[PDB]
Design an enzyme around this catalytic site. Structure first.
Site, mmCIF file in Angstrom:
data_model
loop_
_atom_site.group_PDB
_atom_site.id
_atom_site.type_symbol
_atom_site.label_atom_id
_atom_site.label_comp_id
_atom_site.label_asym_id
_atom_site.label_seq_id
_atom_site.Cartn_x
_atom_site.Cartn_y
_atom_site.Cartn_z
ATOM 1 C CE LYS A 1 -48.499 79.157 34.653
ATOM 2 N NZ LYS A 1 -49.591 79.815 35.423
ATOM 3 C CE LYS B 1 -45.755 73.421 34.183
ATOM 4 N NZ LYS B 1 -46.738 74.442 33.724
ATOM 5 C CG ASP C 1 -52.083 77.679 33.132
ATOM 6 O OD1 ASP C 1 -52.869 78.631 32.951
ATOM 7 O OD2 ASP C 1 -51.460 77.510 34.198
ATOM 8 C CD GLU C 2 -49.786 76.576 37.082
ATOM 9 O OE1 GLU C 2 -49.162 76.310 36.034
ATOM 10 O OE2 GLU C 2 -49.762 77.698 37.629
ATOM 11 C CG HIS D 1 -46.709 72.432 38.719
ATOM 12 N ND1 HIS D 1 -45.802 73.254 38.092
ATOM 13 C CD2 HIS D 1 -47.666 73.242 39.221
ATOM 14 C CE1 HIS D 1 -46.191 74.508 38.214
ATOM 15 N NE2 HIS D 1 -47.319 74.528 38.895
ATOM 16 C CE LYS E 1 -32.852 81.705 45.661
ATOM 17 N NZ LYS E 1 -33.135 80.321 46.127
#
Lengths: 456, 207, 73, 456, 453, 73
Positions: A159, A185, A187-188, A278, A318
């Site tokens: 990333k 993966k 980076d988008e 994604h 959370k």
């Protein structure tokens, strides 16, 4: 219509098993009742009239009509209600998600007498589930293609680097895959941009994959990003990626749309690659708790349209007010029959008619001290993405991959024998990090978390 | 042929007391001949993994696919975790020919509640689906701390966990509609305490 | 428009959507001969041609006040 | 027409060598003669008139007319006759089986004055045989492609198991093929169904074939089922199966039709794969002995349309009243000149004009103690399918294949040295099952049959 | 576990709404009970075992097996029963009717322990109805395309087809269509024989259609037979018939198969052509009561795969029961929801989920004296094919066309008034024929007044 | 065509519908009474035929549990 009960709010009505149900959470303007607001939401999502002055000449009405059959108040909040309404089956095209979206949420969200509107769930009948294709492969086939049984799979996005050449990109991918990871993966934001065009990236990534897989002995991958400006450019990238022999590709299903995602899913089904979806640009639609479209609706629409992996976000940080909702939705996209349970957000009982499942991907700033938790929350039918917990090891890329691999296998091996993973996470990791310097270094900088008192 | 750069690997694995002095080819031959029971040659594949043999290589030599290998290893581990604790020898005398697939679904439970779940699953004669749903209900029980009638179903009995699941799923409905009574009758057919029974009788039959 | 406590219901037609024709008052015949002479008294009402109703102007027949679909304005 | 002999029943007529003859077995209603019924069957299969009021303006008559030239009674049965009628050659399209069927059996089977009608045989002239293509390859080419000389070939369907994952399917196929079989057959109900789509099945089966053939040293196969909903889907499956390098495919020629079977046979001839035809849904047409279409007619129509293997059913458990008929129509599809013989069901003398032959497949609940019989009865040119006689061996899939292989080679090697196979089947098998544990276990599981007194 | 249980005859099992039900009428061999034979029919047409020694490899079965759940016997006949069977939904694939046929009626008919077996009805769930395409157009759409409202349609078959050159064929078609008919039909067994090839015939037929269309002022049509030996030739013929501008084609779905019929139906939907289905070679399968496949099952399978018209055969002269049966499945071709009425053959309740209808076609050499009966039995949603009833008029082809046209519209008008068609049929025909010579000639030629009780 | 007990649809008599049956050569311990030259199962503990599983498929019905048409598989 009048004091006559509106012919749209029919509480004595029970829906048939071929009706599409929808549950809105709405909050109306001052000085407007609840029943009238429910009937108005029912009339806006369909023929926009209460009367019969247009929609009655001979017969053609009272069929294409969205009755509203339940209204109740939300507990805790004031001036906020749940409205359950039910649409027939003849309003919807066969095999199109675009049509369902633009028919339910087409232009009701702009109703003036409503202060705010949210779409909390939806129920597709089986008769409509069976006209879509679904995920190209699923869970079992996707597990058999890669030959990875028992454990969850590992991955490492690259990333923070941006502006790297194509060759150094291939080099980092090689170092990561050789060390012991499974996927990797893009980076988008990375498409063909002037410092790094797409065909060069594809070439060097494919070379790295072949080298590492040949000298390791198992199957490796890399999610190549085929998001493009047009249908032609996108199909061209996908064909070239298949030619090189790549197992898996990637797409963005919210900025590119549902037409392009359906097209790509049919291509992937014909040609035998897996599709990783994604979710980008989603907080624009489902962040605020009082307006928008909750995300479980989009998870269902994606299980229908097509996709094998889906980002769902972690739950390690959370409370049980939202950990519940995320677990609830995670079950909504792996199993085959989900019973109604409002504590986990599931409003309706949904039966999926032996359609395959998708695979949840948990990502975003996680490190080794989280591995005990994840391994027993998501179970072992999931994927784990390590953004910074891998590339930042004190002495390289391959050692970081080795550290993560060792930690994962230690935790899963321990889980099977019966040992708890809430009481004994830390000591499991410490006992494993004794015959391996990599895991010792990784445990050093990253800090322990101590979830709660002793569990959860 | 060493598969390059597999640094992720335990030092070794425990071997049974009988095959402590065999080589790799002895393990290969006893695997390919089935010349033991499954819980006797599961540690052998678990140990062969740590000598540079990959599941595809073992599948090529012996002839058991990777899914079966994983199921065997996990099942033998669960069986050991059962037998090393309080029990009666009848079920270990029953887990001798084809108990791996059923032991593979209760691996989610800690060693305490494992021996309790095994009795239920082998007495009611349940298959993989029922075992999976039973384990899932047992694991879902603790995080429902506040509910309707939660402390009337005990925790140390599997039937009562499953009965609580059914009861809570039925309560998420309205009066009978023949869809709530079916689930209440399902819950009554599996519970095995007495407070559970008189509570479900209060619910299903008469206020 | 609207009735107030229940804002949506039309106030002019009270939800009828159609209303009695305001020209012939539901009689279906013209009260007076038109200046043009195309329409004559006692024959047919010029506006509704005898049907004795029209659509209510406020809601354009929808019975809806402020609906995004129909009479959004 | 009248007491005048109907102009359709002409017993003094002898047919040309370019006429298509047909033999019906009919049984008429009470109070109707035999000759009138013959002439009426002749008039229904063509111009539906006895007179010349429509079919004579200038010359349009006596050219497209099905004379009936023989009628005789059936021996044994009462009120039941054989009618031989003969059609010209100009009524039929060149190269189409659909047309021949819909012209002979089009709408005569619904004649009211007939109580029941059966079509027992048919004779195509050479002038019509030579306009069809025939089987893609035949017997000799099909034997040379695979390099299997002398013995019959073995195969093992995987029928009892259902719901199998694609990978376990590939695994079972591998275990069978490695052990010593030659072919392996898909269940015929298996198409792309939600638990097992077609492209995954094709992938894993191809991998198994390549592995076993590489490590054994001979040519293996697997009948992949390419039956599909449309011409497009079917051609797509077939192209993908050729790409993987598969030698043979499969089809169902009665539920899919003759148009699709002809299309597929032309594709197979162009691209060099062999075609295996599976006769399903046939007992719907040819079970009852008093109505329908006997199966030898469909065997001829298949030899014309296209196909290399054909299911014909075993004869080990029948009497000489039906063993005769089955041997008859097994000769009707291997040889090149068959003389008329009514004891074996052949009604007309058929000459095939050097068109290749098809290959009979004998299947359905057979085991080792049958191997002596089948060997001599069906001969070398046959395929033997072992459904349960292989997959049920006491200790696995590969040992069962080894047992069947050993038994077959023992029987054929013994037949080469003159030993009888009716007197000495059992002792041949017992003498062979002494240096091999597999054949011993197989002989001990099933039970000897003892055909008859000492032979047949 | 022992089989005295049979584990397949579950008499209390109620079937889901996503199960495919089938109803067999069987008669078993001497010495075999009924419930065993029902369980055996359920097991033959699924995994062929009663036991669990194979399927229970790893705790996964009892979801791919059918199960008999009702074995009532037949009234009147003895030693013959009904058996109802329910199959799960995940056994069949979508869009494929060959798969349904192969999976139900596969090898079950070859079972040895039963004398005879017939398949009487079948019920497709909506979940499965919704994955097929259906008719290309339907009924409403095709009445709108052809622009003919409020009466049946009229068609003629051409009987002296053999040895007739292509040009005389075209001239006969022109004469018939010019008189007042709507459709002409190409004989079933006329594809490409050496005396008359297909391109040379499509040409002249199209020419005649164009000529008559303008002069009559009506939209005319001729079913052109596209049944070919391959997928390629079939597609070539269809493309040529579209290029010429033809509105309707023809096919034979029992000799060509279901794969070719589905392919043709998809083409016809994409290119706006109507499709007429001819039912040649059907008595081979469904004539004898003891064995076969009743025709209503094939009518359902046809409505699923594709087709706009369908031959169904006249019902004027059947006795009863055998007549009320036919009417039965006519309602399975037009109506969308049909309730179970065993007196009319319908075994299960079938709901079609708003899939279009199919148009019946009555054929069989009917003449003018049959016009009342037909006009009130089939209603106005049908086609009436005439054979000799049009080409046999003493004057020619155009007079016979006008005769049939006049008779039909006369019957329709009286029916609108409410005159009973059957009671006054002779009278209605007589009065119309007074101011028309053609109808008078026809009335006399076909002396069959066809008394109506 | 074996039929268990009274005539039925030939539930195979040899097993009465069990499909599997006890294997002939193992008593109690899945032991092999037989001693053979190969020696794999001759020594004792493992039965030669069923390898210790103590059952095989029935030879008459091949595990189907019934005969009739389906003697096969």
């Amino acid at each position: 219509v009048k004091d006559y009960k509106l012919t749209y709010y029919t509480p004595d009505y029970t829906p048939k098993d071929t009706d599409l149900l929808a549950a809105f959470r709405f909050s109306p303007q001052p000085g407007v009742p609840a029943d009238e607001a429910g009937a108005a939401i029912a009339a806006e999502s369909s023929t926009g009239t209460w009367t019969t002055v247009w929609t009655d000449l001979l017969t053609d009405m009272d069929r294409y009509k969205g009755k509203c059959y339940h209204i109740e108040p939300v507990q805790g909040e004031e001036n906020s209600y749940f409205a359950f309404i039910a649409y027939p089956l003849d309003l919807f095209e066969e095999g199109s998600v675009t049509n369902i979206l633009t028919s339910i949420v087409g232009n009701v969200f702009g109703f003036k007498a409503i202060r705010s509107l949210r779409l909390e769930d939806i129920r597709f009948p089986v008769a409509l589930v069976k006209t879509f294709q679904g995920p190209p492969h699923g869970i079992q086939v996707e597990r058999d293609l890669l030959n990875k049984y028992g454990r969850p799979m590992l991955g490492c996005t690259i990333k923070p680097k941006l502006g790297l050449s194509a060759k150094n990109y291939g080099r980092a991918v090689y170092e990561c895959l050789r060390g012991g990871l499974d996927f990797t993966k893009d980076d988008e934001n990375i498409n063909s941009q002037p410092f790094q065009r797409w065909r060069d990236r594809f070439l060097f990534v494919a070379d790295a994959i072949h080298k590492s897989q040949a000298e390791t002995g198992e199957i490796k991958g890399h999610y190549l990003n085929v998001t493009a400006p047009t249908c032609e450019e996108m199909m061209k990238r996908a064909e070239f990626a298949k030619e090189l022999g790549m197992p898996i590709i990637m797409h963005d299903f919210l900025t590119a749309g549902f037409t392009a995602n359906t097209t790509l899913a049919k291509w992937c089904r014909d040609n035998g690659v897996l599709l990783h979806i994604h979710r980008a640009m989603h907080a624009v639609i489902d962040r605020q708790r009082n307006h928008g479209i909750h995300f479980r609706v989009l998870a269902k629409c994606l299980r229908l349209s097509g996709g094998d992996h889906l980002h769902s976000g972690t739950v390690v940080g959370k409370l049980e007010g939202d950990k519940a909702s995320t677990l609830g939705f995670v079950d909504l996209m792996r199993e085959d029959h989900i019973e109604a349970d409002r504590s986990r957000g599931v409003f309706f009982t949904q039966d999926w008619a032996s359609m395959p499942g998708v695979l949840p991907v948990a990502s975003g700033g996680i490190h080794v001290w989280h591995m005990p938790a994840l391994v027993e929350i998501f179970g072992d039918d999931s994927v784990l993405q390590f953004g910074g917990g891998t590339l930042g090891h004190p002495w390289g890329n391959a050692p970081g991959a080795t550290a993560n691999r060792v930690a994962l296998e230690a935790c899963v091996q321990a889980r099977n024998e019966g040992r708890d993973l809430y009481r004994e996470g830390g000591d499991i990791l410490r006992e494993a990090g004794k015959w391996s310097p990599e895991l010792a270094a990784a445990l050093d900088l990253w800090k322990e978390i101590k979830f709660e008192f002793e569990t959860m | 042929m060493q598969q390059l750069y597999q640094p992720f690997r335990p030092p070794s694995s425990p071997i049974p007391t009988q095959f402590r002095s065999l080589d790799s080819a002895g393990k290969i031959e006893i695997l390919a001949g089935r010349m033991a029971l499954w819980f006797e040659y599961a540690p052998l594949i678990s140990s062969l993994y740590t000598d540079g043999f990959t599941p595809p290589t073992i599948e090529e030599l012996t002839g058991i696919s990777s899914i079966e290998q994983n199921r065997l290893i996990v099942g033998a581990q669960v069986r050991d975790s059962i037998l090393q604790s309080i029990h009666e020898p009848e079920l270990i005398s029953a887990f001798d020919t084809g108990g791996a697939e059923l032991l593979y679904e209760i691996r989610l439970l800690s060693t305490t509640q494992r021996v309790a779940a095994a009795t239920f699953i082998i007495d009611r004669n349940i298959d993989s689906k029922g075992a999976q749903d039973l384990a899932r209900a047992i694991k879902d029980y603790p995080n429902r701390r506040g509910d309707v009638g939660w402390l009337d179903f005990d925790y140390n009995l599997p039937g009562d966990c499953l009965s609580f699941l059914y009861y809570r799923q039925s309560r998420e409905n309205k009066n009978p509609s023949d869809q709530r009574t079916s689930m209440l009758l399902q819950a009554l057919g599996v519970a095995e305490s007495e407070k559970a029974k008189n509570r479900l009788n209060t619910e299903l039959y008469g206020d | 428009q609207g009735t107030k406590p229940n804002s949506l219901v039309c106030a002019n037609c009270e939800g009828e959507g159609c209303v009695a024709c305001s020209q012939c008052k539901g009689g279906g015949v013209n009260l007076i001969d038109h200046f043009n002479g195309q329409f004559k008294a006692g024959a047919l009402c010029w506006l509704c041609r005898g049907k004795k109703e029209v659509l209510c102007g406020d809601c354009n027949g929808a019975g809806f006040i402020g609906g995004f679909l129909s009479t959004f304005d």
